[PDB]
Design a protein around this ligand. Structure first.
Ligand SMILES: CC1=C(O)\C(=C/N=C(\C=C\CNC(=N)N)C(=O)O)C(COP(=O)(O)O)=CN1
Ligand SMILES: CC1=C(O)\C(=C/N=C(\C=C\CNC(=N)N)C(=O)O)C(COP(=O)(O)O)=CN1
Lengths: 377, 378
C-alpha cells in the first residue's frame, strides 16, 4: 500500500482531500482555452512537433524566470514528473549511485526509485532550516554519491528560498566539492512565483556556473487545472547530458503536440494574470482550513511556500493520524495520513495529516465544516 | 543512437515516413469528436475518474472482442505502451529474470529493457512460421525464464494468427509446461480486427485458462490519429497481479480523464465503421508503396497482417539500408534503416528498410514518386 492507492479510493468520494492533483474548475479566461481546443488540435496537426516543444519550453521558463535554461536549450519533455524520475532512476542505476532522499516527501518518489533497486537513505528536512548549518550537516550526513531534494517540499511547503540564494548555494557548494550528483524536483516551484521575498531565482544559472552534476525536474501538473493532460521537463548537466538523452529517447519520442499547444495557452494565461487564478483558489481554501481547524486537534503547520497542500500535526494524547484518517473517512472526508510521507520509518508520520487544497472552494468549505464536526467528537 | 532519434529528425522533414505514430488527418466523423472537445473536457471535469477508466476499458475490449479481460477487470492504464513496458521491466528486474525477445522488433523495446539491466537474448521470428515446429523450437531456443513476443510484429506484420488459434496455443503450452513468464505486446492487434480469417480471438480466455504467468500490453496510439494523446493497458496473471499493481501505482495515479473520454469516442467511432477510416488510409498507402517500388532495389515483404508499417528487403549486391536511407534523406524522404530492428546484431538489419504508412495519402503518394526517382538513379 502507498499514498497513490489511498488517492485512488479518495477519487471515488465527493470530499476527496487526498491527491494533490488539480480538481478546481476553470477560471473565466481558462474557459476560453477550453473553447479553442478544436483549433488547438488542428493547429498541432498541421505544425511541426519541434515548434510546439519550443513554444511550450519558452513559455514555461519565461514564466518561471529561468532564462539560462533557454540558452542551454537541452531540456527534455515527458508525460509526467514520475516519468522524468524514472529516467533519472535509469541513470542512477547505470552509474551505481545510491540516493540520499529528503524525508518527509511524497512516497511515490521513494517507491519508484526503490522499485528500480536504487539504494535509498533518508535525510531530514530540518537539515536545511539553518542556512549556516546546511554544509556541515551535509558533510556529516550524506554518505551516498547522489542527493535528491524536493523544493518546495511536499507535504511541508518548505523551501531553501527562505534563505534567498544562499540555501541553494550551500547545497550546490557541498555537491560540487564532494563530487555528488544533485537531483532536484521543482514541481511545486510555481507557487513561489511573483512572491515578493520567495520568488525563485534562475536556478539553472547557479547549476551551470557551479559545474555540479545535476538533474532538475519541472512540472505543469500541480499548477494548472489541466485534468492531468500534462508535461514534465528534465534538464541535465552537460557532462551527463548525452547519457540521459539516450535514456530519455528509449522512453518516448514526443509528448502530444496538442497537449503541448494547450499547456502553452495555460502558461501564457497565467503570465497575464500573474498566477492569480491559481493562487486565489489555494488562498481561499488554505484560509478556510486554518480558520475552521484553529484550536482543533489538527494543528496547522505554516509552510514556507504557499503550496497546494496543507500539513497538520495531530495534537491529542491518544489519537494518531491513523485514527483521524479513519474517523474522517467514516464520515466521507478523505485526507492522507502522514505515515507514508516518512518513507524510511512510517511510524514517524503517525502524528501528521495532509490535506489537498487544489479544490473547488464550495466543496472544500463543506468538507471543512464536516471535518470540524467530526473532530468535535 | 536508436530509431527514436532517427524519428526525431524525421519529424522536421516534409516526407517523414519514419515513425509509426499516426499522422493522417481526421475522418469526417472523427472531426465531430474534435469539435466536441470542450464538451468532453467538462464531462471529465465534473465526472469521476473511475467512470472514464471503466468506459474506456469497456469500449476498448468490446472493439477488440476480449470479453474475458472485462470479466477479470484487473487491467491498468498508463500514458503509453512504453510506460507499461517499463512496469513490466520493473517486474522482470525484481524477479531477476532473463528475457528471450523476438527479433526483429522495434528497438525501443530492447532499449527500455536493457536500460533497466534486463538480460536480453534474441529469438528469430521464423521460429513461428511453421505451427508444428513452434514447440520444439522454443524448447531448444528459449533458455531464459521469460519470453517476450510482439504480435502482430513490428516491422514485419507477422502474426501467429496465421495459424488460427493454434500458434498462440503452442506458445502458451510451451510457457506453461516449462514455467516461463509470457510477455506479449499487442499494440498492432487492432489491424487484425474485422479481418475474415485473421481477427484476433479472445487472448485473455487462453491466457487465463492455461494458468500461465503473463503480462499483456495493449495500445491505442498506433491505431487512431490522436496526436499521441493516448493510453496503454497492461494485464497480469492472477499470481503476479498484486506485485504488478503495486509497481504500477508507483508510476502514476491516473491517466487524464479528458484523454480517456476523448479516446473512448474514437473507439466507439471505429466500432461504428468497422475500423474503415483506419484501414482504408493504410491500404491506400500500402498499395501505393507496393506498386511504386515493384521491381526496384526495395523488395516488398508482404505481411501476414495489414499493419501500419511496410517492410522491404534491399535487393542489391553492394548497397545497404544505411546507403538507401542516406540517399533518400538527401532528397527529403526519411525512412528507417532496418539495423536497429535487429537489436541483437544490427548489421542483419542493413538488409531491410521500414516505411510508415499512417500518413495523409496525398503526401504519401508524393513521397513514393520521389522515392522511386531517387532509387532509379542508383
Ligand atoms: C513534488 C512532486 C509531486 O508532489 C508529485 C506527485 N504528487 C502527488 C501525486 C501522486 C500521483 N501518484 C503517482 N505519480 N504515483 C501528490 O498527491 O502529492 C510528483 C509526481 O507527479 P506525477 O504524478 O508523475 O504527475 C512529482 N513531484
Ligand atoms: C509494437 C509497439 C510499438 O511499435 C511501439 C512503438 N513504435 C514506434 C514508436 C516509437 C516511439 N519511440 C519511443 N517510444 N521511444 C515505431 O516507430 O515503430 C511501442 C511504444 O509505443 P509508445 O511510443 O510508447 O506510444 C510499443 N509497441
Amino acid at each position: 500500500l502507498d499514498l497513490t492507492q489511498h488517492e485512488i479510493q479518495a477519487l471515488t468520494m465527493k470530499y476527496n482531500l487526498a491527491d494533490a492533483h488539480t480538481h478546481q474548475r476553470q477560471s473565466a479566461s481558462q474557459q476560453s482555452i477550453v473553447s479553442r481546443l478544436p483549433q488547438l488540435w488542428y493547429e498541432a496537426e498541421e505544425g511541426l512537433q519541434a515548434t510546439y516543444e519550443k513554444r511550450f519550453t519558452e513559455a514555461f521558463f519565461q514564466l518561471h524566470r529561468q532564462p539560462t535554461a533557454l540558452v542551454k536549450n537541452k531540456t527534455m519533455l515527458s508525460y509526467a514528473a514520475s516519468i522524468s524520475t524514472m529516467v533519472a532512476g535509469m541513470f542512477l542505476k547505470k552509474e551505481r549511485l545510491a540516493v540520499t532522499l529528503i524525508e518527509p516527501c511524497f512516497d511515490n518518489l521513494y517507491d519508484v526509485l526503490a522499485n528500480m533497486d536504487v539504494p535509498l537513505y533518508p535525510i531530514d528536512e530540518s537539515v536545511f532550516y539553518d542556512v549556516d548549518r546546511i554544509y556541515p550537516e551535509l558533510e556529516r550526513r550524506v554518505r551516498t554519491d547522489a542527493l535528491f531534494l524536493v523544493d518546495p517540499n511536499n507535504p511541508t511547503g518548505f523551501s531553501l528560498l527562505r534563505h534567498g540564494r544562499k540555501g541553494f548555494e550551500e547545497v550546490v557548494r557541498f555537491c560540487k566539492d564532494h563530487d555528488k550528483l544533485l537531483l532536484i524536483d521543482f514541481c511545486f516551484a510555481s507557487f513561489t512565483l511573483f512572491e515578493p521575498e520567495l520568488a525563485r531565482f534562475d536556478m539553472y544559472e547557479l547549476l551551470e556556473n557551479s559545474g555540479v552534476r545535476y538533474l532538475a525536474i519541472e512540472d505543469t501538473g500541480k499548477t494548472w487545472p489541466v485534468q492531468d493532460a500534462k508535461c514534465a521537463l528534465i534538464t541535465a548537466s552537460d557532462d551527463i547530458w548525452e547519457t540521459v538523452y539516450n535514456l530519455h529517447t528509449s522512453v518516448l519520442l514526443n509528448v502530444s503536440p496538442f497537449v503541448l499547444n494547450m499547456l502553452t495557452q495555460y502558461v501564457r494565461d497565467s503570465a497575464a494574470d500573474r498566477l492569480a487564478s491559481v493562487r486565489e483558489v489555494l488562498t481561499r481554501n488554505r484560509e478556510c482550513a486554518r480558520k475552521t481547524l484553529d484550536g482543533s486537534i489538527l494543528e496547522y503547520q505554516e509552510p514556507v511556500v504557499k503550496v497546494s497542500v496543507a500539513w497538520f500535526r495531530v495534537d491529542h494524547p491518544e489519537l494518531t493520524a491513523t485514527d483521524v484518517h479513519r474517523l474522517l473517512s467514516a464520515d466521507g472526508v478523505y485526507v492522507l495520513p502522514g505515515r507514508y510521507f516518512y518513507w524510511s520509518e512510517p511510524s514517524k508520520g503517525d502524528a501528521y495529516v495532509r490535506m489537498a487544497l487544489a479544490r473547488e472552494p464550495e466543496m472544500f468549505a463543506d468538507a471543512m465544516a464536516l471535518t470540524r464536526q467530526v473532530l468535535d467528537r
